[PDB]
Amino acid sequence: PIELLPETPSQTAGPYVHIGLALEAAGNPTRDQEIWNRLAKPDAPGEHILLLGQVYDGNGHLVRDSFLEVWQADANGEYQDAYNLENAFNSFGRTATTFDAGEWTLHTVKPGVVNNAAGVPMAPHINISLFARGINIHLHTRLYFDDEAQANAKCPVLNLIEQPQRRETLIAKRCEVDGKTAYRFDIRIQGEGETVFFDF
Amino acid sequence: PIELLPETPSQTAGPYVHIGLALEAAGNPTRDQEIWNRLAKPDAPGEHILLLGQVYDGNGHLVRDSFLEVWQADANGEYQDAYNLENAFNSFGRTATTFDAGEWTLHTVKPGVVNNAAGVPMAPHINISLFARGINIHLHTRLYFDDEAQANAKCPVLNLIEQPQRRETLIAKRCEVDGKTAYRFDIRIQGEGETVFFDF
Amino acid sequence: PIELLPETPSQTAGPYVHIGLALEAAGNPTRDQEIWNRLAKPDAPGEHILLLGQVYDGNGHLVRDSFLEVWQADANGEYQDAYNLENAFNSFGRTATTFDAGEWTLHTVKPGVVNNAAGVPMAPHINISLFARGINIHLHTRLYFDDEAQANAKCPVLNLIEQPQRRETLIAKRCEVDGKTAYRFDIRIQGEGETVFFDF
Amino acid sequence: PIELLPETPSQTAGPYVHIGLALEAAGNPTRDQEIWNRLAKPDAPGEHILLLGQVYDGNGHLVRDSFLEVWQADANGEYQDAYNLENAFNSFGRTATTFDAGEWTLHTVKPGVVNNAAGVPMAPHINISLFARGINIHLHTRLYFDDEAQANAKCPVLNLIEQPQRRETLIAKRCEVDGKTAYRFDIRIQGEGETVFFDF
Amino acid sequence: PAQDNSRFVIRDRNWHPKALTPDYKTSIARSPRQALVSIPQSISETTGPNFSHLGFGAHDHDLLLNFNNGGLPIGERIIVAGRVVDQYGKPVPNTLVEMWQANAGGRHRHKNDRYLAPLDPNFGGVGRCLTDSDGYYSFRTIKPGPYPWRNGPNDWRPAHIHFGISGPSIATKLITQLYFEGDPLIPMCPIVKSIANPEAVQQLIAKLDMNNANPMDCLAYRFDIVLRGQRKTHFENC
Amino acid sequence: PAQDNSRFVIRDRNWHPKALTPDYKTSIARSPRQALVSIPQSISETTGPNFSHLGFGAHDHDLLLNFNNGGLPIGERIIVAGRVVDQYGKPVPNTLVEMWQANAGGRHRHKNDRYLAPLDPNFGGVGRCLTDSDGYYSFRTIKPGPYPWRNGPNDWRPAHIHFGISGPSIATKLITQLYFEGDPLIPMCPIVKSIANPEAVQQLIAKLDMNNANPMDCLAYRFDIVLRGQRKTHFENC
Amino acid sequence: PAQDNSRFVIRDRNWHPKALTPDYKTSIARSPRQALVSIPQSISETTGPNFSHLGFGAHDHDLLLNFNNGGLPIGERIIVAGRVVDQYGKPVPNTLVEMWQANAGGRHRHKNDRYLAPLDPNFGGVGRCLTDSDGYYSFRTIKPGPYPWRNGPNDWRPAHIHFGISGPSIATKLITQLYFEGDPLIPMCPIVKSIANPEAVQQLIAKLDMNNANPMDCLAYRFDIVLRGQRKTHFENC
Ligand SMILES: [Fe+3]
Ligand SMILES: [Fe+3]
Ligand SMILES: [Fe+3]
Ligand SMILES: [Fe+3]
């Protein structure tokens, strides 16, 4: 067959992933410019939300040395690629769970609708990549919203999952925290209730 | 040591098994003569029963593309090996579970008793082979009856299973479907309550 | 691919082919029973004919150490396989060109019509195999009759030949010799006017 | 020594060459634009000629599945390389002989004179490439004109052919078809009068 | 009625694929985590149906004609033939052989096949036949096309045909897949790679058979299937 | 008008097939018995048409749609793509590439094809395309089936597609055939065996290209064609 | 906004480490037991952040200086440099490369590192940089030392430096570890041994690069990274 050069193999981020990538959460001084958990400056368009969740292992213990990167469209269904700390909105951001903060958070806006490669709209989602010690190659998932039930039933992606129960693990449950709209999205890596992870 | 020719290797029966083995079911036109689920015709001797079950995977979900082959003695405990669609009793049959049918059913008579190689009687049992996608080599099991507790307690095959709670998985439960005597044999492929599978 | 045992390779019959196969034409005493040039006893059915021809090489010189075997249906279009020197007709026979006889002959009957594998009639022909020194693997040809023009135009075999002129080389020209119907069929092995040879 | 990448090897154009290169001819529907046999449109400058020939094999039989590509200077002796179906003159064309057409024809103007690499003029010539089944690599030839005897006698390409009777084979014969000036170039592939073929 | 006079060679479960072969995704939730319990062979295992009296239609083995809707299927005409023998090399006579497959383009005639390649109006995809006295079987069909499936992101099944074979007993029944000689998809398919030993993969590649082909018509492939060796019982219960 | 500024590497006639290769029957009466006369390269040989302005239809390279009679051809969907370079490795931009082939079953859409396999109502069999600035070309089609022909008694052509390539000059134009990777018919075909060196046979086997395939849709093969190297003239007439 | 014009070559999950690799203890509870669900690539997977306008400090690729409490770190001064290409060998310009590593002693500047090797007060451990127009990146740093960890009773990670590379999309983002030429700890570590093919391991080893070293000042190592291949979309929804 035709053989290309091989991709460099993945390796675990390890316990000290924070020092290269969450300088604050390692409790080390920062630089002038850091990629972090504020996607939306408070004056950006769309519905402002707060995301949070916990990450469990197969024994049901909290994973507190975990790192998350996210990618999502703005409120109009557009992916803003030029990262800049001066934009009102960026489509990328990073967040982490710590020994102190067992929980992660992210401040952003509910993403609008994007179409897939066939022109079919997917429901609002945020793409999530999860790295931590013990994970050899990061895990890809998607975060969807419970108040979008209809778009969720028609999604070409959520419908590639055979079992209806497994679709429920990608669904974040709406709540409120200090008068602000919040969604909780917990990740179970292994076991009872395992979140669905994707390949692409 | 002495080597014989090796056995062609098994391959899964795949998602489309019905197209070649369960014609009606793939929703295709049939041939004049098919190997199906009526093992006994209404004027056959013995007690008429109806069996049914559902097939589960490791996550507690139905296996809707399974295909089962069964082999059993008639009512006086003899294997009718000459298959014929005119005979009143065939010892062999075939059934499937479909997206439409989550359940398989088989119309037969309760089998009689046969001896093992050592001369010891076995409790009434149907021999079962199971095939489906994701199964690389088929599985072997035996369906026993719950109202044949004394014969079951002395069967020299059920006794080869070390743990008692494991012998239970092999016991179809007497019930009633349309007021006609029935037995329910559910198969759990993997997990809690996994059905015992054999090798011989 | 699948490989069978190889066929034994051919070798030239050589100059002395006559001694094993034309004992008379080598001028050696014969045995009680010889396979020869009289296919038809004079009282056999059909139209009695005399065949003769010469065999040239590529330089136009006569080949006088040549050996021919023939196979043809009787007058009813039937191939008589049981060779016996007492039958009125045999479908096989052998003949040869000598230093004395530069010409070969055969006494037989015009063959009736046979069908090919698709049921289509071939025109009357005699199959000829030619062996001699200098020929590594014998040559197969067919002898057809000039007074059978119509059957010849419809023959599935003569029509497998692309060029119309090359079909003419398999056509024997009718003549008479001492009041007896004769056909001359000359073979040119090579060169101007080369007879067509077949593979099968 | 220095080795470059080797050239993909040639393969015969086969019996079905017309299906991809001479669409009308395979008796198939055409596309809006085809590369065919009219090199000059009626209002193109130069003397209009019509060429035709037949193609022979080694046995003196017509080659009815040949396909020819030609390349020529216009009337002032220039190669118009930009192919366009609107130009009044294209230097390139394509023609074929069919079971229907034993003959190819090409509608062009007599070409002008061009110099070789050394500055010496060549006699008017059409460059020809020939393809057919049984030809593994195509053949190169040049068509010259018989009424251009003086230019032909001094052409530095015709003079590279050692034997004079061989130079003749390259000379198309002036004739008349429908009272329109024509040249006849017959090709003999093999044999007596074999056309000279080139390599460059 | 059938008699217990036979024993069958125990299966080599390292030769056959294992239950759990994770690269073949579906197998994760479909395989037992406990061990198979081992049982001595009795008459329940050593007898099996005989299908000699089954009423076969004239084109049951002839996929070029058994579906037919005034026509010929499109694709490579091929005869697939072979012989069924046990591990000792003994032929296996009047055995049931079933097969099924996709069409030339990789589409299966079944509701669940959502694949873009079209259905061929003159092709069904099923065949059956009983082996002769010498264990020979044969069918005629069109070579299936490879097809994509949702396992990994750009996984493609090599061309194959599925086979079922009953044999003398239910201890001998097998379902397998024939692949075709030289298919560069073979080494990449996770279902094929579920077989650990490469010499076992080889036993599933039907080889091009020119001696069996019909000149000017159809090619042929040969596929010989070997079932568990059958022996007579000796020294039992003493 | 075209200028003589180029020379082309002389052809290796031992690399290419010879004229007379008797196992390929037709070649007996179709090959010259005298030697090719050798000529220096002039402008007649080093110039050739450029087809940039040729009016190509939208589906000219797309055999799945260019014939179409309310439908999709039956057979393996494949993209065949590659690159055209000269012997020095330089790409060959805006070159004409033509191809033609049989259908899935080995039948050609042409009067002379008398073969029993049927015509596919949605398939033509021709395509063309111009290479891009980098020398890339590409088409989409169905994998042809092999077919029988009257050469020897049970001779079968392997699956192939025919190719024509113009290149920069008439000295570079070539017609060839692509075969597919692993086809057990390849080593047996007398037309393929007309090429004496096995490394030259290799250059005609299009290889399976999974990185170029469209997941859940069509596979791809790669075929790179190499034309005579082109150089600038140096030290000529001194 | 970003546009979906690209497709990425599918990853080989047999080349990367598997999720469950038992000798690497922490992976046992941190790995899916269910199969990864394949999905087709869309604009959500095919676009990613571009860090061209992020504002890098002057010393962010310079670990000898970016922490600095008026002094130089202790340890082998080395330049680590290389190039980032895709699987087609195309450079990946303007991509973000970030790296983190321990000090000359195996100690990380992090609260959970309770290891007895001291902190180096002039050393932080982090850098970042953007590749150039040609795919080149570069760092100045001190060679890290090996450290022990609580996995088996006497396990030691070889010297390594962590890298995260963004690439053009989130489909290409990758986290890996670079190892040093000839470190005899490499073949012994369970984290390295989670990569099953040894050639794949070989790609993680940085080679001593003397041509790039500064005489009398610092050695150099070379590490090139290969990101998933990027191709244009072709023949999509016809
Ligand atoms: Fe580390
Ligand atoms: Fe299949
Ligand atoms: Fe001798
Ligand atoms: Fe062809």
Curated annotation (Swiss-Prot), chains A, B, C, D:
| Pfam family membership, one | Dioxygenase_C
Key word ATP-binding present: no
> Keyword annotations for this protein?
Aromatic hydrocarbons catabolism, Dioxygenase, Iron, Oxidoreductase
Stored InterPro entries:
Intradiol_dOase_C, Intradiol_dOase_core, Intradiol_RC_Dioxygenase, Protocat_dOase_a
Cofactor(s) of this protein: Fe(3+)
Q: How is the cofactor bound?
A: Binds Fe(3+) ion per subunit.
GO biological process terms held by the UniProt record: beta-ketoadipate pathway
Q: Which reaction does it catalyse?
A: 3,4-dihydroxybenzoate + O2 = 3-carboxy-cis,cis-muconate + 2 H(+)
Locate the residues binding 3,4-dihydroxybenzoate.
Answer: 133
Does the keyword Iron feature in the UniProt annotation? yes
Which Gene3D superfamilies does UniProt cross-reference here?
Aromatic compound dioxygenase
Metabolic or biological pathway: Aromatic compound metabolism; beta-ketoadipate pathway; 3-carboxy-cis,cis-muconate from 3,4-dihydroxybenzoate: step 1/1
Q: What is its EC number?
A: 1.13.11.3
GO molecular function per UniProt: ferric iron binding; protocatechuate 3,4-dioxygenase activity
SUPFAM superfamilies according to UniProt: Aromatic compound dioxygenase
Quaternary structure, per UniProt, is:
The enzyme is an oligomer of 12 copies of the alpha and beta chains.
> What NCBIfam families does the database record attribute to this sequence?
protocat_alph
Q: What does this protein do?
A: Plays an essential role in the utilization of numerous aromatic and hydroaromatic compounds via the beta-ketoadipate pathway.
What the record says about family reads: Belongs to the intradiol ring-cleavage dioxygenase family.
Question: What protein am I looking at?
Answer: Protocatechuate 3,4-dioxygenase alpha chain
Swiss-Prot record, chains E, F, G:
Q: Which is a GO BP term held by this UniProt record?
A: beta-ketoadipate pathway
Q: What is its EC number?
A: 1.13.11.3
SUPFAM superfamilies registered for this protein in UniProt: Aromatic compound dioxygenase
Q: Binding residues for Fe cation, per the UniProt record?
A: 108, 147, 160, 162
- Per its record, what are the GO molecular function terms? ferric iron binding; protocatechuate 3,4-dioxygenase activity
This entry's comment on the bound cofactor is: Binds Fe(3+) ion per subunit.
Domain of life of the organism encoding this protein? Bacteria
Subunit structure of this entry? The enzyme is an oligomer of 12 copies of the alpha and beta chains.
Under which name does UniProt file this protein?
Protocatechuate 3,4-dioxygenase beta chain
